[PDB]
Enzyme design. Sequence first.
Site, short mmCIF file in Angstrom:
data_model
loop_
_atom_site.label_atom_id
_atom_site.label_comp_id
_atom_site.label_asym_id
_atom_site.label_seq_id
_atom_site.Cartn_x
_atom_site.Cartn_y
_atom_site.Cartn_z
N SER A 157 22.22 4.83 33.81
CA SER A 157 22.13 3.60 33.05
C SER A 157 21.20 3.80 31.86
CB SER A 157 21.61 2.49 33.95
OG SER A 157 21.33 1.30 33.24
N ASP A 210 33.07 2.16 51.16
CA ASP A 210 31.72 2.65 50.86
C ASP A 210 31.81 3.79 49.85
OD1 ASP A 210 29.14 3.45 50.82
OD2 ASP A 210 29.09 4.21 52.88
C1 LIG Z 1 24.13 7.25 53.09
C2 LIG Z 1 23.81 6.72 51.70
N1 LIG Z 1 25.00 6.21 51.06
C3 LIG Z 1 22.81 5.58 51.77
O1 LIG Z 1 22.04 5.63 50.62
C4 LIG Z 1 20.81 5.05 50.88
C5 LIG Z 1 19.76 5.82 51.34
C6 LIG Z 1 18.55 5.23 51.61
CL1 LIG Z 1 17.19 6.21 52.21
C7 LIG Z 1 18.38 3.87 51.42
C8 LIG Z 1 19.44 3.12 50.96
CL2 LIG Z 1 19.26 1.38 50.69
C9 LIG Z 1 20.66 3.70 50.70
#
Ligand SMILES: C[C@@H](N)COc1cc(Cl)cc(Cl)c1
EC number: 3.4.23.22
Length: 330
Positions: A199, A35
């Site tokens: 981008s 991640d």
């Molecule tokens: C913890 C982060 N890496 C996640 O980032 C986000 C945050 C929101 Cl509120 C929505 C989405 Cl689809 C991804």
Amino acid sequence: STGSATTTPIDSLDDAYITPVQIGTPAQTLNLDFDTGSSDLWVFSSETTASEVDGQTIYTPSKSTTAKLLSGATWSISYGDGSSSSGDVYTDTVSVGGLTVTGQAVESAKKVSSSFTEDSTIDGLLGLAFSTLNTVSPTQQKTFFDNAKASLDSPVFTADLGYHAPGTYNFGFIDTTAYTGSITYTAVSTKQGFWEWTSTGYAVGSGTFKSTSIDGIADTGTTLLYLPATVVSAYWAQVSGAKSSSSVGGYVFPCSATLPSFTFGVGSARIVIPGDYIDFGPISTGSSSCFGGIQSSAGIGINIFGDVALKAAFVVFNGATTPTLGFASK
Ligand SMILES: C[C@@H](N)COc1cc(Cl)cc(Cl)c1
Ligand SMILES: C[C@H](N)COc1cc(Cl)cc(Cl)c1
């Protein structure tokens, strides 16, 4: 040193990707979600509330001769999709694709939210964003990449996610056979702890390229592509019958549609996402309404170049003194 590991979609929709990781001595292999949008390496464990474990492989630190409890350390994370997890911390040996880090912080879950329990294929996360986001308290811990970086041949890792197919994470080298053309590098801001970049614009299908700055994050841990409402509206307007559904939670489209491609700019370069990459299948089993892979970022506060975008490219996460991001077609 270098490492190289295959990453595999968890399901037929590429909802996430898992990569095997060896933890401890003897090794305990867990399949983790790499991640680039977070900075904690956390795992399902022998300490996880039993009712919250449903098919995951667990890390048992008491069976690892190299595990050591990090005294007083706890962690707790809330992700942007509403999921969360928390627990205590060990240090242990962690290896990815032949690259080994000793003394890596391995965050053992005592509690996980329902979305983690309900996904038997993901045994934890391996965060690859900047260590400033790591949640361990009272002493923040370093990511696997930050711990490995000085030993690597080059201070880089690359993401090569497949479409409906396996792909590769490499550490310490760029596989010049894995992409076509050249890699275009672009500036990164680390101020928010993310691989944040701008981008240069977009096109829908064969339409004209719109030059416009789109600030967002390169996030392998997010499935979809989240972009400004104007951009997303322009995309879905090219799909007959597509609409934003408040009940479903985003744009949906008839499963019989042929989706147009979506192009995003990286400097003067262009990455083309084929239309099929934007189809996330029926909204519920048996439905003829399908979920779109490009969604509005309104309310997120940031645009997110998730797997839908990244899997169309070979992506270089350059962790040099001044980090940069590279994109190539493939
Ligand atoms: C913890 C982060 N890496 C996640 O980032 C986000 C945050 C929101 Cl509120 C929505 C989405 Cl689809 C991804
Ligand atoms: C035996 C082959 N030479 C291996 O090549 C591939 C092919 C795909 Cl589709 C994905 C990955 Cl990860 C590796």
